[PDB]
Write an enzyme that holds these catalytic residues in place. Structure first.
Site, PDB file in Angstrom:
ATOM      1  N   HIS A  62       0.877  -1.217   0.000  1.00  0.00           N
ATOM      2  CA  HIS A  62       0.000   0.000   0.000  1.00  0.00           C
ATOM      3  C   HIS A  62       0.897   1.244   0.000  1.00  0.00           C
ATOM      4  O   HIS A  62       0.443   2.325  -0.393  1.00  0.00           O
ATOM      5  CB  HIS A  62      -1.084   0.129   1.011  1.00  0.00           C
ATOM      6  CG  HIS A  62      -0.684  -0.225   2.400  1.00  0.00           C
ATOM      7  ND1 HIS A  62      -0.243   0.663   3.340  1.00  0.00           N
ATOM      8  CD2 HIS A  62      -0.681  -1.434   2.986  1.00  0.00           C
ATOM      9  CE1 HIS A  62      -0.010   0.021   4.473  1.00  0.00           C
ATOM     10  NE2 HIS A  62      -0.242  -1.252   4.276  1.00  0.00           N
ATOM     11  N   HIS A  92       6.516   6.766   6.009  1.00  0.00           N
ATOM     12  CA  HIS A  92       6.011   6.356   4.662  1.00  0.00           C
ATOM     13  C   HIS A  92       5.364   7.589   4.024  1.00  0.00           C
ATOM     14  O   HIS A  92       5.198   8.562   4.764  1.00  0.00           O
ATOM     15  CB  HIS A  92       4.996   5.215   4.741  1.00  0.00           C
ATOM     16  CG  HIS A  92       3.845   5.584   5.634  1.00  0.00           C
ATOM     17  ND1 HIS A  92       3.792   5.346   6.954  1.00  0.00           N
ATOM     18  CD2 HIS A  92       2.683   6.218   5.283  1.00  0.00           C
ATOM     19  CE1 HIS A  92       2.660   5.854   7.452  1.00  0.00           C
ATOM     20  NE2 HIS A  92       2.003   6.360   6.413  1.00  0.00           N
ATOM     21  N   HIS A  94       2.230   9.126   1.079  1.00  0.00           N
ATOM     22  CA  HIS A  94       0.981   8.996   0.321  1.00  0.00           C
ATOM     23  C   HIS A  94       1.187   9.909  -0.873  1.00  0.00           C
ATOM     24  O   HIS A  94       1.740  11.056  -0.659  1.00  0.00           O
ATOM     25  CB  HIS A  94      -0.283   9.437   1.096  1.00  0.00           C
ATOM     26  CG  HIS A  94      -0.443   8.599   2.314  1.00  0.00           C
ATOM     27  ND1 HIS A  94      -1.163   7.452   2.368  1.00  0.00           N
ATOM     28  CD2 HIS A  94       0.150   8.745   3.522  1.00  0.00           C
ATOM     29  CE1 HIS A  94      -1.089   6.911   3.572  1.00  0.00           C
ATOM     30  NE2 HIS A  94      -0.297   7.670   4.248  1.00  0.00           N
ATOM     31  N   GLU A 104      -3.043  13.649   2.042  1.00  0.00           N
ATOM     32  CA  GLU A 104      -4.293  13.160   2.717  1.00  0.00           C
ATOM     33  C   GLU A 104      -4.989  14.351   3.349  1.00  0.00           C
ATOM     34  O   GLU A 104      -6.162  14.655   3.092  1.00  0.00           O
ATOM     35  CB  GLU A 104      -3.912  12.098   3.731  1.00  0.00           C
ATOM     36  CG  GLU A 104      -3.356  10.825   2.982  1.00  0.00           C
ATOM     37  CD  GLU A 104      -3.542   9.619   3.887  1.00  0.00           C
ATOM     38  OE1 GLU A 104      -3.121   9.509   5.034  1.00  0.00           O
ATOM     39  OE2 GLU A 104      -4.163   8.739   3.270  1.00  0.00           O
ATOM     40  N   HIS A 117       4.457  10.745   6.439  1.00  0.00           N
ATOM     41  CA  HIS A 117       3.999  10.432   7.786  1.00  0.00           C
ATOM     42  C   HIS A 117       5.099   9.809   8.609  1.00  0.00           C
ATOM     43  O   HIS A 117       5.648   8.761   8.172  1.00  0.00           O
ATOM     44  CB  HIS A 117       2.742   9.504   7.798  1.00  0.00           C
ATOM     45  CG  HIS A 117       1.545  10.218   7.251  1.00  0.00           C
ATOM     46  ND1 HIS A 117       0.428   9.662   6.734  1.00  0.00           N
ATOM     47  CD2 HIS A 117       1.272  11.553   7.143  1.00  0.00           C
ATOM     48  CE1 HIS A 117      -0.509  10.511   6.368  1.00  0.00           C
ATOM     49  NE2 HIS A 117       0.032  11.717   6.597  1.00  0.00           N
ATOM     50  N   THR A 196      -4.802   6.294   8.905  1.00  0.00           N
ATOM     51  CA  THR A 196      -5.512   6.599   7.663  1.00  0.00           C
ATOM     52  C   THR A 196      -5.630   5.364   6.756  1.00  0.00           C
ATOM     53  O   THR A 196      -6.246   5.481   5.666  1.00  0.00           O
ATOM     54  CB  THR A 196      -5.015   7.864   6.921  1.00  0.00           C
ATOM     55  OG1 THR A 196      -3.751   7.489   6.339  1.00  0.00           O
ATOM     56  CG2 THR A 196      -4.963   9.154   7.803  1.00  0.00           C
TER      57      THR A 196
HETATM   58 CO   LIG Z   1       0.194   7.563   6.323  1.00  0.00          CO
END
Ligand SMILES: [Co+2]
Length: 258
Positions: A62, A92, A94, A104, A117, A196
């Site tokens: 992911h 990590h 997004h 996000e 994050h 999240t």
């Molecule tokens: Co995150």
């Protein structure tokens, strides 16, 4: 089937397997800058990452996580709205398929190209697994990325991506210093929220930095080359692995600045 970011298993479907998805303290959220309350009682953040020990980078299907040794107080966060010491376990990102999306959290509805994050867990709980079950178990630092100039300190990360292209691949990744990813200012917004991604547990104190860091187009381009799938499976590029903004509900966003 299992959750992801496609049309058939995307964020809008997560509630079927994880009912907390429609909870009272879900993340991310839109940060309305004119409704956030400056709170003079919030202390400056204290980031001590000089003893940080990175160990490995992994494609978990992911995103990609850089993991740190969290067996001792080596890389910690304290201060700000926090009580106690929070040890860094992993970071990590997004990101989007295009530069106009990827983050996000949003700011006055503005989306950034990506969001970093840095995940930390409350040492009073002894381990990560216990910390996620508590309302003040984690502290996540979020940093926005905009496309502009290259970020030198992110290059070592970009360069190893080819070796963890598909789900389940990992690579040794020692001696990476996460200080190279911080903006100049530590001014932030804070609110109580959740993870999240499933299991979406509401155990997070979010600390979102006001100042974005810049990355070059080429840097973000390499992120978009990763795959959601495992090796020998049909290719699905890892893009748009972001959950949209959730209702604020009964929550106040506090600002450390005016
Ligand atoms: Co995150």
């Amino acid at each position: 089937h299992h959750w992801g970011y496609g049309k058939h298993n995307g964020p809008e479907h997560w509630h079927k397997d994880f009912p907390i998805a429609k909870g009272e303290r879900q993340s991310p959220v839109d940060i309305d800058t004119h409704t956030a309350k400056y709170d003079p009682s919030l202390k400056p953040l204290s980031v001590s990452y000089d003893q940080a020990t990175s160990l490995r980078i992994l494609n978990n299907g992911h995103a990609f996580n850089v993991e740190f040794d969290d067996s001792q107080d080596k890389a910690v966060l304290k201060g700000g709205p926090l009580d106690g010491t929070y040890r860094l376990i992993q970071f990590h990102f997004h990101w989007g398929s295009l530069d106009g999306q990827g983050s996000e959290h949003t700011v006055d509805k503005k989306k950034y190209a990506a969001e970093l994050h840095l995940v930390h867990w409350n040492t009073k709980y002894g381990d990560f697994g216990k910390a996620v079950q508590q309302p003040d178990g984690l502290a996540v630092l979020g940093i926005f990325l905009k496309v502009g100039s290259a970020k030198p300190g992110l290059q070592k990360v970009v360069d190893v991506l080819d070796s963890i292209k598909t789900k389940g691949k990992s690579a040794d990744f020692t001696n990476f210093d996460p200080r190279g990813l911080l903006p100049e200012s530590l001014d932030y917004w804070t609110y109580p929220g959740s993870l999240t991604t499933p299991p979406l547990l509401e155990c997070v104190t979010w600390i979102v930095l006001k100042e974005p860091i810049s990355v070059s187009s080429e840097q973000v381009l390499k992120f978009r080359k990763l795959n959601f799938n495992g090796e020998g499976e049909p290719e699905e590029l890892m893009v748009d692995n972001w959950r949209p903004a959730q209702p604020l509900k009964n929550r106040q966003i506090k600002a450390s600045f005016k």
